[PDB]
Amino acid sequence: HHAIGYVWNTLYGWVDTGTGSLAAANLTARMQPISHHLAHPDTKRRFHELVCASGQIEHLTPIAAVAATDADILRAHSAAHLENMKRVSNLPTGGDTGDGITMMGNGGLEIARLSAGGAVELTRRVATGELSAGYALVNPPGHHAPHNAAMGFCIFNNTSVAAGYARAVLGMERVAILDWDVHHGNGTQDIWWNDPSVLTISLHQHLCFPPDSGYSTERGAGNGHGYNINVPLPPGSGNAAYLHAMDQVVLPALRAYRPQLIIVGSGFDASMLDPLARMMVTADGFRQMARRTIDCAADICDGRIVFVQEGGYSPHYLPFCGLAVIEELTGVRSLPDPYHEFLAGMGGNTLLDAERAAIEIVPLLADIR
Amino acid sequence: HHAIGYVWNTLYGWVDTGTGSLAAANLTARMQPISHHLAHPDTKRRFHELVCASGQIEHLTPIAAVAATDADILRAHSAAHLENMKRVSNLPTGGDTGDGITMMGNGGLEIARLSAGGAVELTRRVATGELSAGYALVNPPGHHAPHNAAMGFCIFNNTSVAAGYARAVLGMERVAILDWDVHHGNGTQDIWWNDPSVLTISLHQHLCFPPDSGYSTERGAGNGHGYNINVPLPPGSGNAAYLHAMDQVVLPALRAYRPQLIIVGSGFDASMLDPLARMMVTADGFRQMARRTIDCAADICDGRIVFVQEGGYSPHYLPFCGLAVIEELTGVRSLPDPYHEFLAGMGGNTLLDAERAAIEIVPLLADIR
Amino acid sequence: HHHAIGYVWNTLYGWVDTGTGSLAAANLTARMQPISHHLAHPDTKRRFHELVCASGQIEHLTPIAAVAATDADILRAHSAAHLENMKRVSNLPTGGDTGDGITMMGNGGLEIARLSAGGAVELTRRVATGELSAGYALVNPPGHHAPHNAAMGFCIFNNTSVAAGYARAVLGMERVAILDWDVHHGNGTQDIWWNDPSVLTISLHQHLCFPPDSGYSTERGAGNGHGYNINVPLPPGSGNAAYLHAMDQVVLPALRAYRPQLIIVGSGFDASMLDPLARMMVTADGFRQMARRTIDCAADICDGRIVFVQEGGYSPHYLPFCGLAVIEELTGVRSLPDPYHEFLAGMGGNTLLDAERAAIEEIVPLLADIR
Amino acid sequence: HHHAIGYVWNTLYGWVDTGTGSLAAANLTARMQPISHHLAHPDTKRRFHELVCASGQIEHLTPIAAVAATDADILRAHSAAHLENMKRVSNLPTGGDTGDGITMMGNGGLEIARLSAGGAVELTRRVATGELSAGYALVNPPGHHAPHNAAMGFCIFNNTSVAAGYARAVLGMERVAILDWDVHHGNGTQDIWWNDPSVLTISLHQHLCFPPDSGYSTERGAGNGHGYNINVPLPPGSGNAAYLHAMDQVVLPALRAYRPQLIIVGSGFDASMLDPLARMMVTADGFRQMARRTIDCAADICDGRIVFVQEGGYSPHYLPFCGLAVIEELTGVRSLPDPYHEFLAGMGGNTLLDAERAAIEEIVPLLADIR
């Protein structure tokens, strides 16, 4: 049938990103304090508020986040990492999660558990058939956190916690994670590196972040060899490149693999107005990407698809990119993208030779059994 | 000798950009109000504050802005445009300058006059030999405003007001305006379209803004034919492309033309972290661009070079891009770019075939007499 | 017995565009520099809502959707000319001045004004029918300064008067009371019901804080309404002791004398210890005690029918805790401390000063005229 | 005769990192939501500076560069342990807690604390030598809560005491006065000079506003310093009438009795009508009159030697106009109105209430002990 779940929790908007821009404010470096860190939670809150103010919320089934348990977290992460996060969160003013930039406040583990747990709860309810699909608008994000660490503002790897739950608790034999956050999903890649039961795909700007990963030659290991697929694209790639990648690589990979559930790491940092990447995707591009992936799920896994928020750093534009994806889930297309004409004139809608060549990963599809 | 002028006026930081993102907030469109418009003056104020906090201010000669007179403005703009700006500024709550997006507050003409006048005052003092060079950190910007209108948040075309002053008041026969704001300097192009006495050069992202201009075929008209040079570059172009453009096109054009003064429209919206374009220039890239242009001025026009602020929309990073240019003027290189390693890993430092081909404008150099 | 507490929040209450000025607009000639957050910026009320959710109070509330106030609803409190002027201003391509030179609406800003008044109406309807026992409408923009024929003091429509008008005309209640404890005089509400004894209007406020020329004890209504408007102006620096003495000596006796069938509270928190727009010393515990007293009074005299409707309050730091205290008195679930309690308790306001006592006692002889 | 008015602003005064809390840090367990602007955010003082410039007052001032306070400078007001603790905290990779659990410094935040104290010192030196007639040091962080052995109340070092210590030890002045009209008790300054009659310390403040346990009239110094600390605690709601009565009856007579060779004013604007962190009713015209009186007193008794040093004040909207009024009294160029004047004048505070008069009169018998 048709019932679309939606997860927002007030505390997703209360993540304290501090007073720096990216790293902390630093007087010796003359990095002046600023009100809004690049990753400030207001960007995602504005998406939530637009979901409500547009009336999309009336077509969604609100789903309460339920805190991820230690057992849930341990399906994706090491005990040492979980214990370190408990340690850092218990410090009187929080602290450094290990990388020197990713911080948690005192009690910040509460929000990290609710973020991973929002993904799990939506996954559970879609997998059982209570819901047909859904969108978990979580924060903090997940895809940079590998098995043994926090990284890139990610405390736990939300989509991997959800995949682990689908595998262990729901008994699914095959799950796919499709990450279209513009940054390489190195954490997700790491977690399932040796494991063919979770197909991991990352469409991203080549070497945007991290600086040393996301190459096409990173394909997994052992029994997992062939079950990690990176699609690095050049800076300036737009809707044409992204849709060519979907049609030539992503959708064929999903059809070859036959997952029982598709989890999308849904970032909007590939947008035309994002500060933290150089891509040219518009809300109409994300719309088409979502439509294609939802339709693929309908064909191959009884429509079982869960979108989980990753990055995106335009408070101005991200809400409209997100809303387009929500509208593809609900089928209620009731608000225009007010930037559409303005951004459409900038380009990205022609498949350039260098973009085409980057996508033409195609010979690796044959190794997905 | 060596004396570097620097213009900042408090009111440059008081430009009211409203409560929208780009266009105004709009309830029917569900464009939620936001504290900082993309063009909020804090970005440029943070540059000023870094100039001070870094100690660069101790190596600069502060120059007070002096309001541009009607006569000054009329060297670049029509009487109808000036009168319309006086009209709009006199409205009790200001209003629409004509394009439906560019607004002035009540009394906002004061700031527009100080912005153009900051460029004029620095130009005067460099041309006389009181100063060797300088940087006018003005706001609002100028380069989109054509002869008969305000456009793209530009009320008056600051660099053209300064060029007009150099021509009419100082009696210079040849002036060059080099615009490296990432958006096409359509206003400047328009003003001097028929005029070979002001060479206008625009290095920009192709079709970023405006959507219908900046093509290589836009070359001026009449006696001005050959004295407008557009260098449109593809999205994703970085330091390699920008420096190749400098070496192959911009610097040869300046040497062919033999201006008596070089005015640089110094935007930083080509930076790696800018939301309003897709280019990959780092602070080190802007440093090298500035070094090259200052050295060219030393060779061909007795060092007479005036930098005038155009766009740039990263409050995080613009200050460091600007500071690099200031350091090239003063010769005091006392602060690192704290983002250098982070951004250097993202690329843009290899000249791609498509970038090289866009630059290879070279056959037009022969028409500069 | 029955317990179900309604709660109204609409996303658009947080989207009210207060501009780039502090109070009036930014002004270059006056050298009033633009600022991100106007004093009345919606974030203050949004932070209250978010605390209601993050504290877990939301799990004890029954969410009630705001329904846009119709023209008919608005016309029970305001003139046709005022409604038409608001439709006119809201239809202007970039909105404009609502009449006073400071209160503005955006293009389409009438949508939010309707949802604000309509949130009060919807909660009133559902409490009056017995679906709900009581509730809190966390609306924005506020209401109490808007008189019959105008917008004023960032109020477009007089939300509590629209709700009272609905209770009177649609539900057929013969007597309604509006108790306003916003720190500013409820001049709009006073104006609307000035000649009308069917809506008892009470305003507890800082004397001459805003507006400058109203809220005196001598403003008592007119005609058949004479005696059915009660102002309790208090001196600057009044705190919990003064506010509770006013409740016990004046407000609660007035309500008991009048026997309203519904009590509507204009629930502002601008009397708080940390508010920039008044000089009063009320703490979250003070508002808690005020709410408790008023809810208990409603239980005694009108079958518990009480509707709280948000008015002002300008501390984004502290207002959420003041508001949460009132919500907790409605739900009976007292699960979070006021983290400012010790800090503010040391500042005073907890002793009834002679001047405060005397200001309150000025109103006591007027209670006898409430029939 | 001579007229040259020094003015200190340093960009880094605007870069003080006040964090993401309201007052204490953001706290998830307490459900204190993060906020962009802490109550003490530097933008309030930066907006004052920008108004000094945009109003054209800057053209009538002599800009004076702040020079970092040396260890020797700091040690005239504070203990070696406190200085070493501040060097320790500032050297920590991400800074930390200065001791009280709320006052923090960033890594390298000692640089700004030194520039703040050093701005006061540099202006003091240049006024005392006769290079300047008077001046205003618009410093941040503030000073007056920091006692000899600690940081407190967002004060790292006691700027005015560092300046007084310099005047005493380096310039050889035998008598200095510090007049603090920040609305909070200058407990730090009181502590530093408690036993010392060579620095007369006066604090006009809201009674028990902050700290909670100090500022009583009975706190008069000790030993040879007995009689050389004067507290003037005023009740909440006191306005221009009370403040000017306190100036005329207590402050100015105390200064005339003491005959300081230099007057340092701890110039806070947190007594303003719109301040969130106190309940007083002073307007820009009130601060203007206070400044005029004090400058004229300096002209009469110490050859015009007066240095104003910024303390608190938490209205980004209104503080700039309060500060500008003081600057205009120094320059004598009165070129911009207070655009809030009419709005605030209607709220009151301009009548001397009996309780206000009595609070002030409590201090008058202590004037006789100033020898």
Ligand SMILES: O=C(NO)C(F)(F)C(F)(F)C(F)(F)C(F)(F)C(F)(F)C(F)(F)C(=O)Nc1ccccc1
């Ligand atoms: O959306 C993001 N990723 O999907 C993002 F994490 F926020 C990021 F990639 F854009 C990021 F901002 F670049 C980053 F990863 F968070 C980051 F900035 F790169 C970082 F992680 F914070 C970071 O800079 N990490 C470093 C760690 C060690 C040494 C240098 C950098």
Ligand SMILES: O=C(NO)C(F)(F)C(F)(F)C(F)(F)C(F)(F)C(F)(F)C(F)(F)C(=O)Nc1ccccc1
């Ligand atoms: O830095 C800039 N230019 O150098 C910029 F003007 F700010 C811009 F190009 F980035 C801009 F923001 F895109 C813009 F030009 F200002 C703008 F947004 F495009 C605009 F001018 F405001 C704009 O959108 N103008 C339009 C006018 C009519 C119809 C549609 C758009």
Ligand SMILES: O=C(NO)C(F)(F)C(F)(F)C(F)(F)C(F)(F)C(F)(F)C(F)(F)C(=O)Nc1ccccc1
């Ligand atoms: O909470 C408030 N009222 O309950 C308040 F309206 F916000 C106010 F009273 F505090 C207010 F802010 F003071 C005001 F009422 F909004 C205002 F500021 F006074 C005003 F209404 F906007 C205002 O200043 N109005 C004026 C109208 C005409 C002439 C001068 C002032």
Ligand SMILES: O=C(NO)C(F)(F)C(F)(F)C(F)(F)C(F)(F)C(F)(F)C(F)(F)C(=O)Nc1ccccc1
């Ligand atoms: O302007 C001020 N003083 O002149 C002020 F310091 F900011 C203050 F008094 F208003 C203050 F904000 F109240 C404070 F002093 F800063 C403070 F908030 F009270 C505090 F110091 F930070 C504070 O609350 N300190 C405490 C220390 C220990 C235990 C409880 C509170």
Ligand SMILES: [K+]
């Ligand atoms: K895998």
Ligand SMILES: [K+]
């Ligand atoms: K990815």
Ligand SMILES: [K+]
């Ligand atoms: K030309």
Ligand SMILES: [K+]
């Ligand atoms: K350009």
Ligand SMILES: [K+]
């Ligand atoms: K009445």
Ligand SMILES: [K+]
């Ligand atoms: K009231």
Ligand SMILES: [K+]
């Ligand atoms: K003393």
Ligand SMILES: [K+]
């Ligand atoms: K004081």
Ligand SMILES: [Zn+2]
């Ligand atoms: Zn990302």
Ligand SMILES: [Zn+2]
């Ligand atoms: Zn630009």
Ligand SMILES: [Zn+2]
């Ligand atoms: Zn109010």
Ligand SMILES: [Zn+2]
């Ligand atoms: Zn203070």
